[PDB]
Design a protein around this motif. Structure first.
Motif, PDB file in Angstrom:
ATOM      1  N   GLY A 184     -14.980  53.709  38.181  1.00  0.00           N
ATOM      2  CA  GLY A 184     -16.048  54.627  38.608  1.00  0.00           C
ATOM      3  C   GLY A 184     -15.517  56.036  38.795  1.00  0.00           C
ATOM      4  N   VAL A 185     -14.391  56.182  39.484  1.00  0.00           N
ATOM      5  CA  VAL A 185     -13.791  57.530  39.656  1.00  0.00           C
ATOM      6  C   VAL A 185     -13.481  58.113  38.268  1.00  0.00           C
ATOM      7  N   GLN A 186     -12.803  57.359  37.390  1.00  0.00           N
ATOM      8  CA  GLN A 186     -12.357  57.856  36.062  1.00  0.00           C
ATOM      9  C   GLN A 186     -13.598  58.267  35.248  1.00  0.00           C
TER      10      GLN A 186
ATOM     11  N   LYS B  91      -3.718  70.163  30.771  1.00  0.00           N
ATOM     12  CA  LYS B  91      -2.896  71.250  31.357  1.00  0.00           C
ATOM     13  C   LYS B  91      -1.431  70.793  31.482  1.00  0.00           C
ATOM     14  N   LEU B  92      -1.168  69.532  31.846  1.00  0.00           N
ATOM     15  CA  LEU B  92       0.209  69.018  32.123  1.00  0.00           C
ATOM     16  C   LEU B  92       0.956  68.766  30.800  1.00  0.00           C
ATOM     17  N   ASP B  93       0.237  68.476  29.715  1.00  0.00           N
ATOM     18  CA  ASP B  93       0.827  68.314  28.360  1.00  0.00           C
ATOM     19  C   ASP B  93       2.007  67.339  28.464  1.00  0.00           C
TER      20      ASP B  93
ATOM     21  N   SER C 267       8.147  65.121  36.268  1.00  0.00           N
ATOM     22  CA  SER C 267       7.670  66.388  36.883  1.00  0.00           C
ATOM     23  C   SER C 267       6.231  66.161  37.354  1.00  0.00           C
ATOM     24  N   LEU C 268       5.421  65.438  36.566  1.00  0.00           N
ATOM     25  CA  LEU C 268       4.053  65.024  36.998  1.00  0.00           C
ATOM     26  C   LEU C 268       4.149  64.385  38.386  1.00  0.00           C
ATOM     27  N   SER C 269       5.095  63.474  38.586  1.00  0.00           N
ATOM     28  CA  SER C 269       5.339  62.809  39.895  1.00  0.00           C
ATOM     29  C   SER C 269       5.420  63.851  41.017  1.00  0.00           C
TER      30      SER C 269
ATOM     31  N   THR D 108      -6.229  61.117  54.967  1.00  0.00           N
ATOM     32  CA  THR D 108      -5.948  59.710  54.614  1.00  0.00           C
ATOM     33  C   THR D 108      -7.252  58.926  54.629  1.00  0.00           C
ATOM     34  N   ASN D 109      -7.687  58.415  53.475  1.00  0.00           N
ATOM     35  CA  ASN D 109      -8.767  57.392  53.372  1.00  0.00           C
ATOM     36  C   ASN D 109      -8.588  56.637  52.052  1.00  0.00           C
ATOM     37  N   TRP D 110      -9.356  55.571  51.858  1.00  0.00           N
ATOM     38  CA  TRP D 110      -9.236  54.680  50.681  1.00  0.00           C
ATOM     39  C   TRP D 110      -9.710  55.453  49.449  1.00  0.00           C
TER      40      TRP D 110
ATOM     41  N   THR E 153      -8.333  57.594  44.198  1.00  0.00           N
ATOM     42  CA  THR E 153      -8.291  58.787  43.298  1.00  0.00           C
ATOM     43  C   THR E 153      -6.869  58.966  42.741  1.00  0.00           C
ATOM     44  N   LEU E 154      -5.831  58.866  43.577  1.00  0.00           N
ATOM     45  CA  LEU E 154      -4.411  58.935  43.140  1.00  0.00           C
ATOM     46  C   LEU E 154      -4.167  57.852  42.081  1.00  0.00           C
ATOM     47  N   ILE E 155      -4.553  56.616  42.401  1.00  0.00           N
ATOM     48  CA  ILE E 155      -4.268  55.447  41.517  1.00  0.00           C
ATOM     49  C   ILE E 155      -5.056  55.594  40.201  1.00  0.00           C
ATOM     50  N   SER E 156      -6.296  56.083  40.273  1.00  0.00           N
ATOM     51  CA  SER E 156      -7.205  56.225  39.112  1.00  0.00           C
ATOM     52  C   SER E 156      -6.700  57.318  38.169  1.00  0.00           C
ATOM     53  N   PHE E 157      -6.138  58.391  38.724  1.00  0.00           N
ATOM     54  CA  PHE E 157      -5.493  59.454  37.913  1.00  0.00           C
ATOM     55  C   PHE E 157      -4.291  58.824  37.216  1.00  0.00           C
ATOM     56  N   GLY E 158      -3.544  58.013  37.948  1.00  0.00           N
ATOM     57  CA  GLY E 158      -2.432  57.251  37.371  1.00  0.00           C
ATOM     58  C   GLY E 158      -2.889  56.423  36.181  1.00  0.00           C
TER      59      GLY E 158
HETATM   60  C1  LIG Z   1     -16.129  58.112  49.501  1.00  0.00           C
HETATM   61  O1  LIG Z   1     -15.045  58.515  48.668  1.00  0.00           O
HETATM   62  C2  LIG Z   1     -14.742  57.720  47.602  1.00  0.00           C
HETATM   63  C3  LIG Z   1     -15.252  56.440  47.450  1.00  0.00           C
HETATM   64  C4  LIG Z   1     -14.900  55.695  46.353  1.00  0.00           C
HETATM   65  C5  LIG Z   1     -14.050  56.205  45.393  1.00  0.00           C
HETATM   66  C6  LIG Z   1     -13.557  57.487  45.525  1.00  0.00           C
HETATM   67  C7  LIG Z   1     -13.900  58.272  46.627  1.00  0.00           C
HETATM   68  C8  LIG Z   1     -13.315  59.623  46.713  1.00  0.00           C
HETATM   69  N1  LIG Z   1     -12.907  60.071  47.904  1.00  0.00           N
HETATM   70  C9  LIG Z   1     -12.340  61.285  47.902  1.00  0.00           C
HETATM   71  C10 LIG Z   1     -12.144  62.027  46.747  1.00  0.00           C
HETATM   72  C11 LIG Z   1     -12.564  61.474  45.555  1.00  0.00           C
HETATM   73  C12 LIG Z   1     -12.418  62.125  44.209  1.00  0.00           C
HETATM   74  O2  LIG Z   1     -11.661  63.325  44.321  1.00  0.00           O
HETATM   75  C13 LIG Z   1     -11.309  64.035  43.195  1.00  0.00           C
HETATM   76  C14 LIG Z   1     -11.738  63.689  41.924  1.00  0.00           C
HETATM   77  C15 LIG Z   1     -11.347  64.452  40.840  1.00  0.00           C
HETATM   78  C16 LIG Z   1     -10.495  65.524  41.000  1.00  0.00           C
HETATM   79  C17 LIG Z   1     -10.051  65.854  42.270  1.00  0.00           C
HETATM   80  C18 LIG Z   1     -10.435  65.121  43.383  1.00  0.00           C
HETATM   81  C19 LIG Z   1      -9.934  65.505  44.751  1.00  0.00           C
HETATM   82  C20 LIG Z   1      -8.868  64.554  45.274  1.00  0.00           C
HETATM   83  O3  LIG Z   1      -7.757  64.633  44.369  1.00  0.00           O
HETATM   84  C21 LIG Z   1      -6.703  63.837  44.623  1.00  0.00           C
HETATM   85  N2  LIG Z   1      -6.777  62.958  45.604  1.00  0.00           N
HETATM   86  C22 LIG Z   1      -5.695  62.203  45.854  1.00  0.00           C
HETATM   87  N3  LIG Z   1      -4.560  62.251  45.171  1.00  0.00           N
HETATM   88  C23 LIG Z   1      -4.490  63.142  44.173  1.00  0.00           C
HETATM   89  S1  LIG Z   1      -3.106  63.349  43.169  1.00  0.00           S
HETATM   90  C24 LIG Z   1      -3.931  64.561  42.241  1.00  0.00           C
HETATM   91  C25 LIG Z   1      -3.166  65.241  41.182  1.00  0.00           C
HETATM   92  C26 LIG Z   1      -3.200  66.628  41.033  1.00  0.00           C
HETATM   93  C27 LIG Z   1      -2.462  67.254  40.051  1.00  0.00           C
HETATM   94  C28 LIG Z   1      -1.690  66.476  39.234  1.00  0.00           C
HETATM   95  F1  LIG Z   1      -0.956  67.065  38.254  1.00  0.00           F
HETATM   96  C29 LIG Z   1      -1.619  65.117  39.344  1.00  0.00           C
HETATM   97  C30 LIG Z   1      -2.354  64.506  40.333  1.00  0.00           C
HETATM   98  C31 LIG Z   1      -5.214  64.762  42.668  1.00  0.00           C
HETATM   99  C32 LIG Z   1      -6.116  65.712  41.996  1.00  0.00           C
HETATM  100  C33 LIG Z   1      -6.458  66.887  42.649  1.00  0.00           C
HETATM  101  C34 LIG Z   1      -7.254  67.834  42.036  1.00  0.00           C
HETATM  102  C35 LIG Z   1      -7.693  67.650  40.730  1.00  0.00           C
HETATM  103  O4  LIG Z   1      -8.478  68.549  40.054  1.00  0.00           O
HETATM  104  C36 LIG Z   1      -8.766  69.785  40.703  1.00  0.00           C
HETATM  105  C37 LIG Z   1      -9.586  70.635  39.774  1.00  0.00           C
HETATM  106  N4  LIG Z   1      -8.844  71.240  38.659  1.00  0.00           N
HETATM  107  C38 LIG Z   1      -8.724  70.296  37.531  1.00  0.00           C
HETATM  108  C39 LIG Z   1      -8.111  70.940  36.309  1.00  0.00           C
HETATM  109  N5  LIG Z   1      -8.879  72.111  35.896  1.00  0.00           N
HETATM  110  C40 LIG Z   1      -8.344  72.691  34.664  1.00  0.00           C
HETATM  111  C41 LIG Z   1      -8.876  73.073  36.993  1.00  0.00           C
HETATM  112  C42 LIG Z   1      -9.525  72.478  38.220  1.00  0.00           C
HETATM  113  C43 LIG Z   1      -7.335  66.479  40.064  1.00  0.00           C
HETATM  114 CL1  LIG Z   1      -7.870  66.239  38.425  1.00  0.00          CL
HETATM  115  C44 LIG Z   1      -6.536  65.512  40.675  1.00  0.00           C
HETATM  116  C45 LIG Z   1      -6.162  64.258  39.929  1.00  0.00           C
HETATM  117  C46 LIG Z   1      -5.555  63.951  43.838  1.00  0.00           C
HETATM  118  C47 LIG Z   1      -8.446  64.944  46.693  1.00  0.00           C
HETATM  119  O5  LIG Z   1      -7.387  65.538  46.880  1.00  0.00           O
HETATM  120  O6  LIG Z   1      -9.167  64.611  47.625  1.00  0.00           O
HETATM  121  N6  LIG Z   1     -13.150  60.272  45.551  1.00  0.00           N
END
Ligand SMILES: COc1ccccc1-c1nccc(COc2ccccc2C[C@@H](Oc2ncnc3sc(-c4ccc(F)cc4)c(-c4ccc(OCCN5CCN(C)CC5)c(Cl)c4C)c23)C(=O)O)n1
Ligand SMILES: OC[C@H]1O[C@H](O[C@H]2[C@H](O)[C@@H](O)[C@@H](O)O[C@@H]2CO)[C@H](O)[C@@H](O)[C@@H]1O
Length: 513
Positions: free
Chosen positions: A411-413, A426-428, A437-439, A451-453, A458-463
């Motif tokens: 659902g998140v993806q 962007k990370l290429d 470096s992504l790490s 901190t919440n689920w 979201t971390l795991i789904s990006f993974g």
């Molecule tokens: C009720 O809540 C829920 C119930 C069920 C399921 C999910 C939720 C939920 N609950 C809460 C939130 C979200 C979704 O949040 C997002 C969904 C999509 C994008 C962002 C976020 C914000 C969120 O991000 C993260 N959350 C946790 N861990 C990490 S590690 C990491 C990450 C970041 C960089 C990396 F290189 C690798 C990984 C991120 C992250 C943060 C921001 C990001 O984009 C910002 C916008 N950018 C994108 C690029 N574009 C060109 C410019 C604009 C992206 Cl794509 C990521 C992956 C990240 C957050 O911080 O809260 N969902």
């Protein structure tokens, strides 16, 4: 960060650091290199924090159990002594400092807890834990107590917890943790009953137990060889003996090998090697340390032969043979943290024995269970096909957490494809260097927010999103190290919150449809 042309050494404040400073002076004499010995508080917690930025000492001393953690994070130089030097120490001490087939520290000495007793109060020490309450009633009538030892560090209570079956990790299967089994519960229940019946106090720490023993107020303590100097000075007439049995079984102390590791970030690696091989691990080097605080049974064969004649060393080795060598695997630090919390909360009545050891079991298993779920989800996302291999222990938790993640993660993806594609492009990423470096980015972004689920999904789904890309570009071998680093970020930064939630059971319940 670390300065060149000198040696900075960290050792615990219970060891012979004035003795070690004398080996330092002798080194400086021959070489013009100044050796500083420090003993910072919680140095075993501070070493990984500072070393990870290329800071900290040239040489760290600790029991071997922490060194696997340090080597996994890349914080130690591999050591490569020649066969002639390796032949001078007991092979079992080298085994304690081998991680992934490589030597990661020099072993110094074998440490095991013994029963220390005051012979003028207690001519025959007790053979069993079970007779200690009556013995305490007798001694209280005379203005004394039977036993005081450090109840703040689980190292000292472990021998009783292990006696009737308690274990950390079976024979080492990281999936098989014996912290909340019947034998562990029986040992910790006997401890809590001692406190409830006023035979011991939950607040007793190292200093209090040491002061009470060394003034002749308590008949018995539990402590290692480092403690004998202070008792020698006090003129208590003491013996060192076999720990009492529990339910007819020996007390099983976790045995440490005091070990010296060399910081990966040190610019003085050849100096540290020369110091440890040719100054410390000699008859005269170890004697200088031993005469400050006894080391126990030293790794160096030539000197162990002299010390072996001491009956206090014979009792140390008898307790050592009934216990077992600590694992050095990286979840040892997590195991100790969980068990420390369990003992203190059970002792203080903050939790029942049941609640306390349940949480300790969850904490000890957290990294393995989290890696299993996160690794399986990234791999099945990447390939379109689920892993056929059995889930092992807590397979129910793993399977339901995985089924929950398939619903909430997909659902998140789906909903955040825009941003995930944006960040990915962007990370290429094209190789495991790019992934490393992504790490680095991920840890910062994930630690920054709350901190919440939802944020954990979201971390795991990006993974999972990145894993699909890695398969696409024939970089599939990068997915396991991506799973590992997401797992590491998650359980390192959110351990306590995860344990309060009942780990992945809390995740399954939170999203239960
Ligand atoms: C009720 O809540 C829920 C119930 C069920 C399921 C999910 C939720 C939920 N609950 C809460 C939130 C979200 C979704 O949040 C997002 C969904 C999509 C994008 C962002 C976020 C914000 C969120 O991000 C993260 N959350 C946790 N861990 C990490 S590690 C990491 C990450 C970041 C960089 C990396 F290189 C690798 C990984 C991120 C992250 C943060 C921001 C990001 O984009 C910002 C916008 N950018 C994108 C690029 N574009 C060109 C410019 C604009 C992206 Cl794509 C990521 C992956 C990240 C957050 O911080 O809260 N969902
Ligand atoms: O209490 C948990 C603790 O146990 C061991 O630490 C010992 C150490 O091995 C001894 O040398 C002595 O200093 O006492 C310590 C206990 O306070 C483990 O080595 C350690 O990693 C763990 O946290």
């Amino acid at each position: 960060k670390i300065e060149e042309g000198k040696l900075v050494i960290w050792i615990n404040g219970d060891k012979g650091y004035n003795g070690l400073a004398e080996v330092g002076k002798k080194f400086e004499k021959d070489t013009g290199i100044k050796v500083t010995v420090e003993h910072p508080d919680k140095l075993e917690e501070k070493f990984p924090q500072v070393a990870a930025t290329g800071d900290g000492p040239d040489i760290i001393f600790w029991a071997h159990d922490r060194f696997g953690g340090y080597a996994q994070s890349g914080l130690l130089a591999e050591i490569t002594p020649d066969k002639a030097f390796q032949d001078k120490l007991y092979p079992f001490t080298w085994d304690a400092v081998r991680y992934n087939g490589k030597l990661i520290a020099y072993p110094i000495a074998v440490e095991a807890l013994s029963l220390i007793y005051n012979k003028d109060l207690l001519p025959n020490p007790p053979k069993t834990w079970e007779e200690i309450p009556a013995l305490d009633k007798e001694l209280k009538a005379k203005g004394k107590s039977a036993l005081m030892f450090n109840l703040q560090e689980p190292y000292f209570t472990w021998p009783l917890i292990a006696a009737d079956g308690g274990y950390a990790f079976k024979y080492y299967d990281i999936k098989d943790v014996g912290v909340d089994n019947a034998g562990a519960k029986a040992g910790l229940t006997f401890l809590v009953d001692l406190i409830k019946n006023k035979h011991m106090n939950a607040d007793t720490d190292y200093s209090i137990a040491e002061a009470a023993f060394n003034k002749g107020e308590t008949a018995m303590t539990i402590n290692g060889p480092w403690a004998w100097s202070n008792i020698d000075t006090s003129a208590v007439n003491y013996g060192v003996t076999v720990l009492p049995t529990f339910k007819g079984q020996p007390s099983k102390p976790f045995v440490g090998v005091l070990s010296a590791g060399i910081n990966a970030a040190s610019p003085n690696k050849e100096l540290a090697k020369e110091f440890l091989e040719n100054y410390l691990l000699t008859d005269e080097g170890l004697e200088a340390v031993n005469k400050d605080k006894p080391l126990g049974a030293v790794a160096l064969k030539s000197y162990e032969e002299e010390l072996a004649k001491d009956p206090r060393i014979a009792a140390t080795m008898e307790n050592a043979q009934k216990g077992e060598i600590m694992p050095n695997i990286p979840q040892m630090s997590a195991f100790w943290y969980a068990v420390r919390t369990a003992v203190i909360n059970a002792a203080s009545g903050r939790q029942t024995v049941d609640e306390a050891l349940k949480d300790a079991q969850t904490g000890s298993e957290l990294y393995r269970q989290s890696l299993e779920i996160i690794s399986r989800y990234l791999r099945e996302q990447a390939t379109g096909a689920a892993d056929t291999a059995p889930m092992g222990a807590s397979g129910a938790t793993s399977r339901k957490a995985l089924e929950t993640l398939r619903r909430v993660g997909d659902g998140v993806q789906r909903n955040h494809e825009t941003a995930f594609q944006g960040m990915l492009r962007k990370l290429d990423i094209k190789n495991e260097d790019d992934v490393k470096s992504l790490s680095r980015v991920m840890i910062h972004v994930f630690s920054d927010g709350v901190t919440n689920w939802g944020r954990i999904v979201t971390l795991i789904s990006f993974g999972a999103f990145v894993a699909k890309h890695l398969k696409t570009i024939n970089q599939e071998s990068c997915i396991e190290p991506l799973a590992e680093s997401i797992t590491d970020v998650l359980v390192r930064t959110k351990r306590d919150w995860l344990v309060k939630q009942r780990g992945w059971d809390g995740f399954v319940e939170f999203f239960h449809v």
